[PDB]
Design a protein around this nucleic acid. Structure first.
Ligand SMILES: [Mg+2]
Ligand SMILES: [Mg+2]
Ligand SMILES: [Mg+2]
Ligand SMILES: [Mg+2]
Ligand SMILES: [Mg+2]
Ligand SMILES: [Mg+2]
Ligand SMILES: [Mg+2]
Ligand SMILES: [Mg+2]
Ligand SMILES: [Mg+2]
Ligand SMILES: [Mg+2]
Ligand SMILES: [Mg+2]
Ligand SMILES: [Mg+2]
Ligand SMILES: [Mg+2]
Ligand SMILES: [Mg+2]
Ligand SMILES: [Mg+2]
Ligand SMILES: [Mg+2]
Ligand SMILES: [Mg+2]
Ligand SMILES: [Mg+2]
Ligand SMILES: [Mg+2]
Ligand SMILES: [Mg+2]
Ligand SMILES: [Mg+2]
Ligand SMILES: [Mg+2]
Ligand SMILES: [Mg+2]
Ligand SMILES: [Mg+2]
Ligand SMILES: [Mg+2]
Ligand SMILES: [Mg+2]
Ligand SMILES: [Mg+2]
Ligand SMILES: [Mg+2]
Ligand SMILES: [Mg+2]
Ligand SMILES: [Mg+2]
Ligand SMILES: [Mg+2]
Ligand SMILES: [Mg+2]
Ligand SMILES: [Mg+2]
Ligand SMILES: [Mg+2]
Ligand SMILES: [Mg+2]
Ligand SMILES: [Mg+2]
Ligand SMILES: [Mg+2]
Ligand SMILES: [Mg+2]
Ligand SMILES: [Mg+2]
Ligand SMILES: [Mg+2]
Ligand SMILES: [Mg+2]
Ligand SMILES: [Mg+2]
Ligand SMILES: [Mg+2]
Ligand SMILES: [Mg+2]
Ligand SMILES: [Mg+2]
Ligand SMILES: [Mg+2]
Ligand SMILES: [Mg+2]
Ligand SMILES: [Mg+2]
Ligand SMILES: [Mg+2]
Ligand SMILES: [Mg+2]
Ligand SMILES: [Mg+2]
Ligand SMILES: [Mg+2]
Ligand SMILES: [Mg+2]
Ligand SMILES: [Mg+2]
Ligand SMILES: [Mg+2]
Ligand SMILES: [Mg+2]
Ligand SMILES: [Mg+2]
Ligand SMILES: [Mg+2]
Ligand SMILES: [Mg+2]
Ligand SMILES: [Mg+2]
Ligand SMILES: [Mg+2]
Ligand SMILES: [Mg+2]
Ligand SMILES: [Mg+2]
Ligand SMILES: [Mg+2]
Ligand SMILES: [Mg+2]
Ligand SMILES: [Mg+2]
Ligand SMILES: [Mg+2]
Ligand SMILES: [Mg+2]
Ligand SMILES: [Mg+2]
Ligand SMILES: [Mg+2]
Ligand SMILES: [Mg+2]
Ligand SMILES: [Mg+2]
Ligand SMILES: [Mg+2]
Ligand SMILES: [Mg+2]
Ligand SMILES: [Mg+2]
Ligand SMILES: [Mg+2]
Ligand SMILES: [Mg+2]
Ligand SMILES: [Mg+2]
Ligand SMILES: [Mg+2]
Ligand SMILES: [Mg+2]
Ligand SMILES: [Mg+2]
Ligand SMILES: [Mg+2]
Ligand SMILES: [Mg+2]
Ligand SMILES: [Mg+2]
Ligand SMILES: [Mg+2]
Ligand SMILES: [Mg+2]
Ligand SMILES: [Mg+2]
Ligand SMILES: [Mg+2]
Ligand SMILES: [Mg+2]
Ligand SMILES: [Mg+2]
Ligand SMILES: [Mg+2]
Ligand SMILES: [Mg+2]
Ligand SMILES: [Mg+2]
Ligand SMILES: [Mg+2]
Ligand SMILES: [Mg+2]
Ligand SMILES: [Mg+2]
Ligand SMILES: [Mg+2]
Ligand SMILES: [Mg+2]
Ligand SMILES: [Mg+2]
Ligand SMILES: [Mg+2]
Ligand SMILES: [Mg+2]
Ligand SMILES: [Mg+2]
Ligand SMILES: [Mg+2]
Ligand SMILES: [Mg+2]
Ligand SMILES: [Mg+2]
Ligand SMILES: [Mg+2]
Ligand SMILES: [Mg+2]
Ligand SMILES: [Mg+2]
Ligand SMILES: [Mg+2]
Ligand SMILES: [Mg+2]
Ligand SMILES: [Mg+2]
Ligand SMILES: [Mg+2]
Ligand SMILES: [Mg+2]
Ligand SMILES: [Mg+2]
Ligand SMILES: [Mg+2]
Ligand SMILES: [Mg+2]
Ligand SMILES: [Mg+2]
Ligand SMILES: [Mg+2]
Ligand SMILES: [Mg+2]
Ligand SMILES: [Mg+2]
Ligand SMILES: [Mg+2]
Ligand SMILES: [Mg+2]
Ligand SMILES: [Mg+2]
Ligand SMILES: [Mg+2]
Ligand SMILES: [Mg+2]
Ligand SMILES: [Mg+2]
Ligand SMILES: [Mg+2]
Ligand SMILES: [Mg+2]
Ligand SMILES: [Mg+2]
Ligand SMILES: [Mg+2]
Ligand SMILES: [Mg+2]
Ligand SMILES: [Mg+2]
Ligand SMILES: [Mg+2]
Ligand SMILES: [Mg+2]
Lengths: 253, 60
RNA sequence: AUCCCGUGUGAAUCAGCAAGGACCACCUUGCAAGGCUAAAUACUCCUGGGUGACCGAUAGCGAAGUAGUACCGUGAGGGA
RNA sequence: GUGAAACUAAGUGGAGGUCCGAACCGACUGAUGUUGAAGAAUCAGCGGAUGAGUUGUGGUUAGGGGUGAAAUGCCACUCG
RNA sequence: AGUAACGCAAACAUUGGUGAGAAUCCAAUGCCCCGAAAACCUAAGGGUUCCUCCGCAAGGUUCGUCCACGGAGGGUGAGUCAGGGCCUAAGAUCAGGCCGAAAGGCGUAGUCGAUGGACAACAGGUGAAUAUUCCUGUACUACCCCUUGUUGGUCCCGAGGGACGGAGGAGGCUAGGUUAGCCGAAAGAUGGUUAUCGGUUCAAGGACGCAAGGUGACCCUGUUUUUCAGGGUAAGAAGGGGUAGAGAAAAUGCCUCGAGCCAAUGUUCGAGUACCAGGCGCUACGGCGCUGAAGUAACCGAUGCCAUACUCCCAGGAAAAGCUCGAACGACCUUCAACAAAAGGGUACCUGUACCCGAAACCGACACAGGUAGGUAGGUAGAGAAUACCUAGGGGCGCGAGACAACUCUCUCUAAGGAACUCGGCAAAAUAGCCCCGUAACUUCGGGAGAAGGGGUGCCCCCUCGGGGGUCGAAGUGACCAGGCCCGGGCGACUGUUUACCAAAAACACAGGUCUCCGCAAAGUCGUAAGACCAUGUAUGGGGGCUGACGCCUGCC
RNA sequence: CUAUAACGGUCCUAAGGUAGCGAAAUUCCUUGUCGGGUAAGUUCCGACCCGCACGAAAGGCGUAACGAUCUGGGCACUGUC
């Protein structure tokens, strides 16, 4: 399950370092920092190399995502990491291409997938790489296809059109029990480098729109507010007219 | 555990001249304005924190 | 009004075009959308002469001697 | 122990924002100090001490800003 | 006002000496203090404070013959130590490139950038002031030089390697230490005594080597599985070879050969006419010349070494160069040219190097009761790097002398009482280690808990491997060191964080809960923009709002 | 029977405070009243409810462990007296 190997050439040390600091060096993305140094595994999300037969040699832990990852070999000696499908066991065999059996871990375009299939690691754009449903226990069903476009129900429940020629992988993403953990102590947050968050109501007026009323503050604001002055609850931020809109059918509920 | 006044500690000279050094003031426009106006006042010493790269005052 | 710029429209060639403090007629004056040009005028880190109902070491330049020095400041800077 | 399992001493094992306690980090009470030995200390006690730990060197973020386990705190004895 | 003070309560004393002058300068003899430093060394910093001679205006909280002060004159020696001539991290700059009134902003290759990777030296001697640097010994890197052997080498490129966490304990060892043995000296005016005092040291490096250590699959039988014993299986370990696919090396697949391997440490050379207790002689009485005995063994034993060796855990633990391997592509060079080797001789780039560095030299305006990374870690008692007393080494605090009032402060003790004190048991006193017995309500079943409470404890013999007997004392963990505890309630679950310098909490955080936004050219944040973060992530994820473990709940408008 | 009000009438609102707690870090009058602890108790504990002006994620009510927390009492101990 989790047994450490030596380092395959897929594990490097190069990476952004200040987490949450941008070019100007400012904290843009709050609360990061601290936490264990990690190494970046190079996942193969495109699965683009066609028509060769891969074998799952092992199953490895990855610090950068909550899913698992699988080291796979080929007859050609090339080694790749793929996201670990749910139920795949060492000794298993996977392949990608157009005309392919449909089993766990095989990747194919959406033209060839029988409606009703449960899919993960879904490209939205030809050859851009897989994007949708990569997290642990994430899965999306392929409901209907018509014309040049295929329809999925994403793990958020949102139904959406994509191109019929975009690759995707059969089977759900493994390590389903991950959100069943209970961290149990503060330190165990910090280990993940998620630093402590202050409630608005606490801070001084300069610092945040729920600023200190004498003892304890009800939020007198006629509305719950972002640090930056926007309504906190139920105000849709989706860009009104984005190109995406023609594709999107039903919105997540 | 140290007093407030202790702001200036023992800091490597290398580090300081990488901050207030000559070659630093030369880089920015604001620095060149610096050196013009020190030269105007006719100071004997342009960049107070400077440092030989190698020599008797060298930091390794 | 005259003048010059953003966005959009967009002329007329001397039987014209512009200006004469909205605008129109008449008369007068002028020729935009190519350039370049000396002097009379401004100034003192200074150079050479000259004068001073200007100072004379707490004055006159911060500085009549190591003076932007000593010293202070991480530094910009302060400064006898 | 039943056929599966549960249940229970035993040994092994060595988990823990575990315990006691020096270094180290702090700063709870008291006394002294108050033209101090010291622009925040000494003395006796006190808290943490494998962690959300301590620290070195080299870096980063700069004032309509930064950083903040949030005190208007801190940003060179200066900070509404 | 000739008043307060003279910067800790480590402590001085005397005899000589120098000198115009000595509580303070030098030496001797005592005494006292530090000894996980108040010792020795190194990073940073300082900058000549280092050493010698001269001086005593100013400085020095007194003095001064003295000095970190003033005047002169000196002093820092490296192929191997530390940086540079090597490599990259965070970060910085950034050709071209994108953006921007200007200045500039973003950013790719490149190039910088050690706190890390790589890379070769130790012992003894000299020594007014330097020493892994100079001397004498053995070493070791990198080049060059010749012989021999090959013909292509060199860079660009393909690869392997470099290359990595925490916690735990068990080994196997050294470093140190202690006691013997050997050697040399010993009479230290006392009742006895040699039971005493000194010595017993040696490095880098080179050759050898490895078990009672650690690793080397399974199956049957036994030793507790283990250390083992017999058999068998056929790669079954470090380690090598071959083959296959577009396929050189590599990776990958199939085949084969190997029972040993690993590395601290150890033996031997280095290494003795080295070093050294004493012995002899000189004394400018400071130091010097001369000859040198023994130089082994046992038991304790690391926080150091093997060691990134193991086992376990989740929070999943740098890059690049040197290095090893190698065909095609490209560039360049080519014969006594280049490369490959074991010897031999040769050859040897800059900069630091003084001194101080738990400090009177750095940081605190002071010769200031303070701050300042790292290294080395002796004795007796002790669990210990705590404490006490000491070694090595270093010190006696840059004002003294008296006297012994009030009073203040740092301390010891106090008859009878025992919180009557006071805002309040504030401060003091009390308790304390170790072994043995015993141990409640309550509970999230982990706790509570060292609960509470009780007993024992020195020194001798005897027995078993704890028990009995004796014996001192008023008192036996006799000093130092070393928990007061119980019964209630509020608040906050908890460890944490916080107002540097008047507030440490009931405030903040927190695990958990819940609402809402966000389909990836995401929402959100910062930018005039380019773009950056978010994220090299993708709804079991990312923003934001309130609440705050666990339990019972969360009503109406 | 004194009393109190389960029950009715009316008024006004978007709707009229349920569970649980309650002289509380909330209680003005107020050292409320009662009980306990003390020779004596404006604090403390338990309970009443007449909540000036509790109350359900600005969470309500419990709660083992924990605290240089706040607050009451007790043994030991003492120049605190
Ligand atoms: Mg790696
Ligand atoms: Mg590797
Ligand atoms: Mg920057
Ligand atoms: Mg919070
Ligand atoms: Mg506040
Ligand atoms: Mg602010
Ligand atoms: Mg902010
Ligand atoms: Mg506001
Ligand atoms: Mg408010
Ligand atoms: Mg209020
Ligand atoms: Mg200066
Ligand atoms: Mg005009
Ligand atoms: Mg006019
Ligand atoms: Mg204009
Ligand atoms: Mg126009
Ligand atoms: Mg025309
Ligand atoms: Mg006009
Ligand atoms: Mg005209
Ligand atoms: Mg014209
Ligand atoms: Mg015009
Ligand atoms: Mg013209
Ligand atoms: Mg012109
Ligand atoms: Mg004068
Ligand atoms: Mg003057
Ligand atoms: Mg005069
Ligand atoms: Mg602990
Ligand atoms: Mg504790
Ligand atoms: Mg603090
Ligand atoms: Mg203290
Ligand atoms: Mg302590
Ligand atoms: Mg402790
Ligand atoms: Mg731990
Ligand atoms: Mg610090
Ligand atoms: Mg903070
Ligand atoms: Mg406030
Ligand atoms: Mg300043
Ligand atoms: Mg300040
Ligand atoms: Mg303030
Ligand atoms: Mg007087
Ligand atoms: Mg007097
Ligand atoms: Mg006096
Ligand atoms: Mg004084
Ligand atoms: Mg003194
Ligand atoms: Mg002593
Ligand atoms: Mg010293
Ligand atoms: Mg020394
Ligand atoms: Mg140094
Ligand atoms: Mg000098
Ligand atoms: Mg000297
Ligand atoms: Mg003098
Ligand atoms: Mg004097
Ligand atoms: Mg003399
Ligand atoms: Mg001198
Ligand atoms: Mg970089
Ligand atoms: Mg730039
Ligand atoms: Mg450019
Ligand atoms: Mg770059
Ligand atoms: Mg460099
Ligand atoms: Mg280094
Ligand atoms: Mg080198
Ligand atoms: Mg070296
Ligand atoms: Mg010396
Ligand atoms: Mg030497
Ligand atoms: Mg020798
Ligand atoms: Mg060599
Ligand atoms: Mg390479
Ligand atoms: Mg490393
Ligand atoms: Mg060991
Ligand atoms: Mg030994
Ligand atoms: Mg003995
Ligand atoms: Mg004998
Ligand atoms: Mg005698
Ligand atoms: Mg002896
Ligand atoms: Mg050897
Ligand atoms: Mg050899
Ligand atoms: Mg063996
Ligand atoms: Mg090959
Ligand atoms: Mg081949
Ligand atoms: Mg191979
Ligand atoms: Mg032993
Ligand atoms: Mg340790
Ligand atoms: Mg490991
Ligand atoms: Mg070629
Ligand atoms: Mg070769
Ligand atoms: Mg030296
Ligand atoms: Mg030296
Ligand atoms: Mg000191
Ligand atoms: Mg002194
Ligand atoms: Mg001092
Ligand atoms: Mg010891
Ligand atoms: Mg003890
Ligand atoms: Mg012992
Ligand atoms: Mg001690
Ligand atoms: Mg001594
Ligand atoms: Mg006295
Ligand atoms: Mg005493
Ligand atoms: Mg008494
Ligand atoms: Mg008595
Ligand atoms: Mg009595
Ligand atoms: Mg009593
Ligand atoms: Mg009383
Ligand atoms: Mg009382
Ligand atoms: Mg009284
Ligand atoms: Mg007390
Ligand atoms: Mg006491
Ligand atoms: Mg006692
Ligand atoms: Mg007990
Ligand atoms: Mg208790
Ligand atoms: Mg007892
Ligand atoms: Mg007895
Ligand atoms: Mg309590
Ligand atoms: Mg109360
Ligand atoms: Mg708390
Ligand atoms: Mg802090
Ligand atoms: Mg404070
Ligand atoms: Mg506290
Ligand atoms: Mg305080
Ligand atoms: Mg706070
Ligand atoms: Mg949360
Ligand atoms: Mg966006
Ligand atoms: Mg709250
Ligand atoms: Mg009352
Ligand atoms: Mg009242
Ligand atoms: Mg009463
Ligand atoms: Mg009272
Ligand atoms: Mg009550
Ligand atoms: Mg109320
Ligand atoms: Mg209310
Ligand atoms: Mg409330
Ligand atoms: Mg409440
Ligand atoms: Mg609410
Ligand atoms: Mg609450
Ligand atoms: Mg409780
Ligand atoms: Mg605490």
């Amino acid at each position: 399950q989790v047994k450490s190997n030596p380092r395959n050439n897929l594990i490097s040390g190069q990476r952004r370092c200040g987490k949450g600091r941008n070019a100007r060096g400012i904290i843009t993305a709050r609360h990061r920092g601290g936490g264990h140094k990690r190494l970046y595994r190079k996942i193969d999300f495109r699965r683009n190399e066609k028509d060769i037969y891969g074998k799952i040699v092992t199953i490895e832990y990855d610090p950068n995502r909550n899913a698992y990852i699988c080291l796979i070999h080929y007859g050609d000696g090339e080694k790749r990491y793929i996201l670990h499908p749910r139920g795949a066991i060492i000794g298993d065999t996977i392949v990608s291409g157009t005309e392919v059996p449909i089993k766990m871990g095989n990747a194919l375009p959406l033209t060839d997938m029988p409606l009703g299939t449960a899919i993960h690691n879904i490209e939205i754009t030809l050859g851009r790489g897989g994007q949708l449903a990569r997290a642990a226990g994430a899965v999306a069903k392929l409901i209907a296809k018509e014309g040049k476009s295929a329809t999925l129900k994403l793990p958020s429940g949102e139904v959406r059109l994509i191109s019929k020629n975009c690759s995707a992988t059969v089977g759900q993403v493994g390590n389903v029990g991950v959100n069943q953990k209970r961290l149990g102590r503060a330190g165990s947050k910090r280990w993940l480098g998620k630093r402590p968050v202050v409630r608005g109501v606490v801070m001084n007026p300069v610092d945040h729109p729920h600023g200190g009323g004498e003892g304890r503050a009800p939020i007198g604001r006629k509305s719950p507010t972002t640090p930056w002055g926007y309504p906190a609850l139920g105000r849709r931020s989706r860009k009104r007219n984005k190109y995406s809109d023609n594709f999107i059918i039903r919105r997540r509920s | 555990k140290a007093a407030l006044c202790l702001t200036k500690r023992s800091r490597s000279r290398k580090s300081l001249a990488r901050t207030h050094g000559f070659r630093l003031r030369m880089s920015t426009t604001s620095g060149r304005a610096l050196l013009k106006r020190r030269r105007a006042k006719g100071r004997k010493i342009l960049c107070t924190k400077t440092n030989p790269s190698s020599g008797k005052r060298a930091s390794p």
